[PDB]
Design a protein around this ligand. Structure first.
Ligand SMILES: [Co+2]
Length: 272
């Protein structure tokens, strides 16, 4: 029976030619966006741009908010903020909560993520006792991406690191998770019996905007499969300046160019 939850979103408008189909995937935590990624299907392949949650942008005409904070008054604010601040005109919207993320990952049979060293987090409940390939469950993967204050073993002691250190490990963990998700998706796309229940469960553990079709989601998956086989599937983190070299983490020239390549510019994007 599984049907996706629906949200009415007024999609932004653009004058840009290069900005084609752009999906906004939001990992949800009065709510905060823990994960913000833009999935770009094209004729070259598929590119995923992971937008750091702590990144501050121009949310509404002459006002600044962090990406994670834009989700609080609703997805409409995040969709609008990305447009006025980064120039990304959202074509489709996917929203996944904590329980939805853990269900989806456990429906994939978990994800294989390399752990460089034993990590723990009292807040998220993360405890990885050894380094190597780990096959993380839904709850483990969620604890890894949510890891606010990761404790690590230094000089025989559990030690916390800087806020920038933790945000860097988060973008890195989300990047690994995103790749592990993509890899597990294709590995489950080989078997026929799997897909039927898998595609059914995914639909029931997702929130979509009113204008995006369950069939539009199938086309994304179809263009992603074609891009996995062609070796044209790429995941990139938005190149922001040294995180511990400024109080506020703002988009730099590197970030603007990388976004300009894919046809995103604030000057050419308009909400409502
Ligand atoms: Co059902």
């Amino acid at each position: 029976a599984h049907r996706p939850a629906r949200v009415d979103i007024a999609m932004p408008t653009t004058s840009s030619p290069t900005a084609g189909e752009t999906w906004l995937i939001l990992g949800t935590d009065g709510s905060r966006a823990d994960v913000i990624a833009l999935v770009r299907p094209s004729q070259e392949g598929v590119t995923i741009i992971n937008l750091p949650r702590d990144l501050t942008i121009n949310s509404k005409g002459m006002e600044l908010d962090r990406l994670a904070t834009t989700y609080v008054p609703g997805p409409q604010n995040t969709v609008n903020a990305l447009c006025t601040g980064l120039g990304i005109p959202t074509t489709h919207l996917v929203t996944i909560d904590m329980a939805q993320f853990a269900t989806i990952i456990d429906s994939l049979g978990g994800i294989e993520v390399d752990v460089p060293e034993p990590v723990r987090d009292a807040y998220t409940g993360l405890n990885l006792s050894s380094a190597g390939r780990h096959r993380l469950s839904g709850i483990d993967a969620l604890a890894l991406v949510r890891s606010r204050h990761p404790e690590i073993l230094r000089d025989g002691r559990w030690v916390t690191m800087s806020q920038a250190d933790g945000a860097q490990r988060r973008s890195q963990s989300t990047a690994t998770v995103m790749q592990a998700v993509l890899s597990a998706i294709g590995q489950k796309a080989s078997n026929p019996v799997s897909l039927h229940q898998l595609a059914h469960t995914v639909a029931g553990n997702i929130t979509l905007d009113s204008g995006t079709g369950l069939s539009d989601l199938a086309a994304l998956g179809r263009s992603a499969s074609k891009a996995r086989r062609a070796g044209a599937t790429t995941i990139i983190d938005l190149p922001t300046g040294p995180r511990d070299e400024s109080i506020i983490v703002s988009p730099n020239q590197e970030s603007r160019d990388l976004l300009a390549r894919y046809g995103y510019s604030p000057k050419t994007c308009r909400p409502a």
